[PDB]
């Protein structure tokens, strides 16, 4: 009923990778590593690198899900809130429950978990283009953290899943999330938070 957290680079070498976006006001998606936290405005584009050592089998799919990371909420389903699942923000593929959703991969699968009522998007695993080391997944994050009914104000991570074609696990990695209207400015006073800490 809750799902692993557990960092797990396993055979193939999974690991994640961000950018380095600074923390300018205007800045619409940051990643703190002394953090592990990703900070980014709703709706807006958030570049997720994938960075193997040797090469998984054709087949092989990346799943994202989140989960509240307190752990007296963690068997909470993350969803978006009543206000944004009525919005008709839909792009034709994401159920408009659904907080994470890819953009532009027409691959791109969403569950409803039968069993545990989670929810994930999930894509089919393609190699880096001619001249790029890693392969990218852009998500949006379709609430804000503090959406009331929805997150409340409660921090997630997103959990990300190296899959083999019948779901099993081939690698694991996660990182805070937390979506806001100014990731940039949150970000230096979390850090700084953090090392008055
Ligand atoms: O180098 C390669 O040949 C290569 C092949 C693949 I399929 C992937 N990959 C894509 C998504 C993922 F989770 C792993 C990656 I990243 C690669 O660097
Ligand atoms: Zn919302």
Redesign the pocket.
């Given at each position: 009923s809750v799902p692993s957290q557990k960092t797990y680079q396993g055979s193939y070498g999974?690991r994640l990778g961000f950018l380095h976006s600074g923390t300018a006001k205007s800045v619409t998606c940051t990643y703190s590593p002394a953090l592990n936290k990703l900070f980014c405005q709703l709706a807006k584009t958030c570049p997720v690198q994938?960075?193997?050592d040797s090469?998984?089998p054709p087949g092989?799919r990346?799943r994202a899900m989140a989960i509240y990371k307190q752990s007296q909420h963690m068997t909470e389903v993350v969803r978006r809130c009543p206000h944004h699942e009525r919005c008709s923000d839909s792009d034709g593929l994401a159920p408009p429950q659904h907080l994470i959703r890819v953009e532009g991969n027409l691959r791109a699968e969403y569950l409803d978990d039968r069993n545990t009522f989670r929810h994930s998007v999930v894509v089919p695993?393609?190699?880096?283009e001619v001249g790029s080391?890693?392969?990218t997944i852009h998500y949006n994050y379709m609430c804000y953290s503090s959406c009331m009914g929805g997150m409340n104000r409660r921090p997630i991570l997103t959990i990300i899943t190296?899959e083999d074609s019948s779901g099993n696990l081939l690698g694991r990695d996660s990182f805070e999330v937390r979506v806001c209207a100014c990731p940039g400015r949150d970000r230096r006073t979390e850090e700084e938070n953090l090392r008055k800490k």
């Open positions: 999974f994938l960075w193997v090469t998984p092989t990346v695993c393609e190699p880096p080391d890693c392969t190296l």
